[PDB]
Design an enzyme around this catalytic site. Structure first.
Site, PDB file in Angstrom:
ATOM      1  N   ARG A   1       0.820  -1.188   0.000  1.00  0.00           N
ATOM      2  CA  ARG A   1       0.000   0.000   0.000  1.00  0.00           C
ATOM      3  C   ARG A   1       0.868   1.258   0.000  1.00  0.00           C
ATOM      4  NH1 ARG A   1      -2.333  -4.708   0.100  1.00  0.00           N
ATOM      5  NH2 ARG A   1      -4.610  -4.699   0.417  1.00  0.00           N
TER       6      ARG A   1
ATOM      7  N   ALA B   1     -11.263  17.959  30.223  1.00  0.00           N
ATOM      8  CA  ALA B   1     -11.093  16.750  31.046  1.00  0.00           C
ATOM      9  C   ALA B   1     -10.143  16.985  32.197  1.00  0.00           C
ATOM     10  CB  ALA B   1     -10.579  15.619  30.120  1.00  0.00           C
TER      11      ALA B   1
ATOM     12  N   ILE C   1     -10.595  16.612  36.371  1.00  0.00           N
ATOM     13  CA  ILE C   1     -11.802  15.857  36.700  1.00  0.00           C
ATOM     14  C   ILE C   1     -11.402  14.405  36.804  1.00  0.00           C
ATOM     15  CG2 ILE C   1     -14.109  15.129  35.930  1.00  0.00           C
ATOM     16  CD1 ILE C   1     -14.275  17.768  34.384  1.00  0.00           C
TER      17      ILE C   1
ATOM     18  N   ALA D   1     -12.747  11.938  34.125  1.00  0.00           N
ATOM     19  CA  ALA D   1     -12.717  12.305  32.714  1.00  0.00           C
ATOM     20  C   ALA D   1     -11.385  11.837  32.144  1.00  0.00           C
ATOM     21  CB  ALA D   1     -12.889  13.787  32.490  1.00  0.00           C
TER      22      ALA D   1
ATOM     23  N   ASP E   1      -4.987   2.262  14.457  1.00  0.00           N
ATOM     24  CA  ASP E   1      -6.282   2.919  14.648  1.00  0.00           C
ATOM     25  C   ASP E   1      -7.261   1.959  15.293  1.00  0.00           C
ATOM     26  OD1 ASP E   1      -5.155   5.031  13.220  1.00  0.00           O
ATOM     27  OD2 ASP E   1      -6.251   4.545  11.347  1.00  0.00           O
TER      28      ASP E   1
END
Ligand SMILES: Nc1ncnc2c1ncn2[C@@H]1O[C@H](COP(=O)(O)OP(=O)(O)CP(=O)(O)O)[C@@H](O)[C@H]1O
Ligand SMILES: CN(C)c1ncnc2c1ncn2[C@@H]1O[C@H](CO)[C@@H](O)[C@H]1O
Ligand SMILES: [Cl-]
Ligand code: NA
Ligand code: NA
EC number: 2.7.1.20
Length: 351
Positions: A127, A176, A179, A182, A309
């Site tokens: 690729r 975030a 917290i 988060a 990913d």
């Protein structure tokens, strides 16, 4: 829809996948196997591709990862995403591909710009990727993004989003930060992100709960932030001991030597070699994780693009389910291994 469990920002890109002859690479001065940004002389590569009947599929690194999360959670709007598209036919193609999967999206339209596109050129069992970001670079996080993202405690950005503006990831992480439950999570994305955005990424990392990256990204992080001595910056990360030192040093970019109840974790993928992670636990002591990667024979590996990913999407799915760090890594390995054994950057229907 919902409940929304994960919110991400990204560069939304339509992938155009086609088998091409070698003359195609040569004509466009592409080097086989590389992944680049379109050069001026490659202006016409996307229209020229039409003669090789390419397939259109949703792409973009972060979009691929939240499409994994959405597939595993199933309920419409389980994952949310924002980024920018053009006011062109391609933007509508991409939007509809995402809508059919049930993903919650808000795509900002940039008049006059073209939707991100990546030619995925198959040739000699390799690729070659050629990306034109276009409208992706216009993305500016809307003021009401926290309302769109209501209910999600897991936030994700790729360092690839810094190429539009680092302010988007910095705002998400800034919400975030502080917290305890988060979780802002970040991908190093590519060696060039580490260098080009050195100071913005240093600031971002202080606000980061989980950092993902592969070996070459972390090698670059270690050299740019002097995380290891000069003598070690050249050492192979295929060496466990080196990998652990790099992860442990990278973790200090997240923790700043402080210890809270918040999550602080660095995860280094290592191809066929075990995943290594360094975690700052509740009381501040650092624990190292080593998770073996099930063997996949070389003959069964179609392509490793999209493996990271998919890893991140499996990890964040497992994290939304309250799983342990090792279980989250194992889910990431499962998703990555599905994706590398067929064409395409999506989980298989049967997964
Ligand atoms: N040869 C291989 N055997 C089994 N699993 C593989 C593998 N290569 C990748 N993986 C899986 O995919 C994950 C990500 O791998 P890696 O660290 O290579 O990302 P990457 O983006 O560098 C691939 P590439 O360098 O070829 O672009 C690994 O953690 C593992 O789960
Ligand atoms: C900023 N750049 C270079 C990029 N930003 C975001 N996603 C990208 C990308 N260049 C390639 N991609 C996507 O990477 C996926 C494979 O890991 C492809 O889906 C492709 O669109
Ligand atoms: Cl992205
Ligand atoms: Na802690
Ligand atoms: Na694949």
């Amino acid at each position: 829809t919902g409940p929304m469990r994960v919110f991400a920002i990204g560069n939304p890109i339509l992938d155009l996948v086609a088998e091409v002859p070698s003359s195609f690479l040569d004509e466009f001065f592409l080097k086989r196997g590389d992944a680049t940004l379109a050069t001026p002389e490659q202006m016409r590569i996307y229209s020229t591709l039409d003669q090789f009947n390419p397939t259109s599929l949703p792409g973009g690194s972060a979009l691929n990862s939240v499409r994994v999360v959405q597939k595993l959670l199933r309920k419409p709007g389980s994952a949310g995403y924002m980024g920018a598209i053009g006011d062109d036919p391609r933007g509508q193609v991409l939007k509809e591909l995402c809508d059919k999967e049930g993903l919650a999206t808000r795509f900002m339209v940039a008049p006059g710009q073209s939707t991100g596109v990546c030619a995925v050129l198959i040739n000699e069992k390799e690729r070659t990727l050629c990306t034109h970001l276009g409208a992706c670079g216009s993305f500016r996080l809307p003021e009401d993004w926290t309302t769109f993202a209501s209910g999600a405690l897991i936030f994700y950005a790729t360092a690839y989003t810094l190429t539009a503006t680092p302010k988007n990831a910095l705002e998400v992480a800034g919400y975030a930060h502080g917290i305890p439950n988060a979780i802002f999570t970040l991908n190093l994305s590519a060696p060039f992100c580490v260098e080009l955005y050195k100071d913005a990424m240093q600031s971002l990392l202080l606000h980061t709960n989980i950092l993902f990256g592969n070996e070459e990204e972390f090698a670059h992080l270690a050299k740019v932030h002097n995380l290891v001595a000069a003598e070690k910056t050249a050492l192979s990360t295929a060496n466990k001991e080196h990998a652990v030192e790099v992860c442990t040093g990278a973790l200090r970019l997240l923790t700043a030597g402080q210890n809270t109840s918040a999550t602080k974790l660095v995860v280094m993928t290592r191809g066929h070699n075990p995943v290594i992670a360094a975690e700052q636990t509740a009381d501040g002591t650092v624990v190292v994780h080593e998770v073996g990667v099930p063997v996949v024979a070389a003959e069964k590996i179609v392509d490793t693009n999209g493996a990271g990913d998919a890893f991140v999407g499996g990890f964040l799915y497992a994290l939304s389910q309250g799983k342990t760090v090792k279980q989250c890594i194992m889910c990431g390995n499962a998703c990555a291994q599905d994706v590398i054994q067929h064409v395409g950057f999506s989980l298989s229907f049967t997964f």
